[PDB]
């Protein structure tokens, strides 16, 4: 029977603190049932970049018991102060939609 979604988890879940010019890496992990497909969507503050340049394209999938996993990752290599804000991942599979969020900080100072 399943077209239900369990949850949408982010990683790193907390303390996402970056210095201006540092690799941002978020991992949106969507847990679903076996007979389920997923469609991701990322909201973010910056408007310089495209969706196809930061968010991954490839199919990261896994299956086990009566569940599955879908992974998508937004990656800003070298950020600016305008890139600071609230980042939201939204998983969508037709009969159900679940999302999750986390705030990415950008401090005006160099990187080691």
């Amino acid at each position: 029977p399943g077209y239900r979604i369990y949850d949408v988890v982010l990683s790193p879940s907390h303390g996402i603190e970056l210095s201006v010019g540092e690799k941002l890496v978020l991992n949106c992990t969507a847990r679903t049932e076996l007979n389920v497909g997923i469609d991701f969507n990322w909201e973010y503050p910056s408007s310089k970049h495209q969706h196809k340049k930061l968010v991954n394209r490839d199919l990261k999938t896994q299956s086990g018991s009566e569940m599955k996993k879908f992974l998508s990752t937004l990656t800003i290599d070298g950020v600016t102060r305008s890139d600071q804000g609230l980042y939201t991942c939204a998983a969508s599979s037709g009969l159900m939609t679940k999302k999750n969020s986390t705030f990415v900080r950008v401090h005006e100072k160099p990187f080691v």
Partner: antibody
Framework: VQLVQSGGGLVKPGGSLRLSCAAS????????MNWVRQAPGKGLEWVSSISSSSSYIYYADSVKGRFTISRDNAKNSLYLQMNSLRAEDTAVYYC?????????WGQGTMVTVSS | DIQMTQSPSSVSASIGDRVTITCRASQGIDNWLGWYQQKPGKAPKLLIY???NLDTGVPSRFSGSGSGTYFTLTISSLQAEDFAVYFC?????????FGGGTKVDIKR
């Protein structure tokens, strides 16, 4: 948070109608949009579903190979091109956002099919 | 697929009464249930989802419970607005089915 529908009305059997549901007040391109109908003095019948970027679609068996659901995220609208109509499709049709359930609903447009 | 049937057909109550409504499924759906309110000449509004989780804006007097195939909705105290039809819903397996509907009306 708001959905506003348009179109509907009279149509003869075999004809064609297109219902449009314009979303407003949220990130339209993130949520799974749906369609649900309700005939005179009847229960709610789910008709169709669609994902954010239109990669996944489901139809209720009754309307399979007839109605075509699609969306335009640039226009923040959901569509339902209804072809090969029947008198049994005479109902009130609602578009609806789906999160964990059907949380938002459009006002609803009555579509009457008769020769 | 799944068949959702409500009980009873219609319930009579005046202002102040504690109303209760039931919804039964043909097969198991754990706790992925919905509850909707519809008034004459309006689109349905979501009251409760996931068995007993009230949507943002719904009064606290509404309350759901139950699991598996058996489910229940309850109104602690009735008010003029509450006179309407109430549907249950299933979101386990496609297609998502609805309940017949129970019209709460004015008792006399």
């Amino acid at each position: 948070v708001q959905l506003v529908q348009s179109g509907g009305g009279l149509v003869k059997p075999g004809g064609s109608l297109r219902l449009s549901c314009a979303a407003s007040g949220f990130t339209f391109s993130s949520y799974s949009m749906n369609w649900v109908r309700q005939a005179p003095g009847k229960g709610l019948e789910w008709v169709s579903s669609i994902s954010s970027s239109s990669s996944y679609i489901y139809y209720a068996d009754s309307v399979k190979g007839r109605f075509t659901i699609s969306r335009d995220n640039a226009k923040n609208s959901l569509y339902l091109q209804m072809n090969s109509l029947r008198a049994e499709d005479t109902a009130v049709y609602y578009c609806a956002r789906v999160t964990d359930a059907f949380d938002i609903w459009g006002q609803g447009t009555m579509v009457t099919v008769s020769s | 697929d799944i068949q959702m049937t409500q009980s009873p057909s219609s319930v009579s109550a005046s202002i102040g009464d504690r109303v209760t409504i039931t919804c039964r499924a043909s097969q198991g759906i754990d706790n992925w249930l919905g509850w909707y309110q519809q008034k004459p000449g309006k689109a349905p509004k979501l009251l409760i989802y996931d068995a007993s989780n009230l949507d943002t804006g719904v009064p606290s007097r509404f309350s759901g419970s139950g699991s598996g195939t058996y489910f229940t909705l309850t109104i602690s105290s009735l008010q003029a607005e509450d006179f309407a039809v109430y549907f249950c819903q299933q979101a386990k397996a496609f297609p998502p089915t609805f309940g017949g509907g129970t019209k709460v009306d004015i008792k006399r």
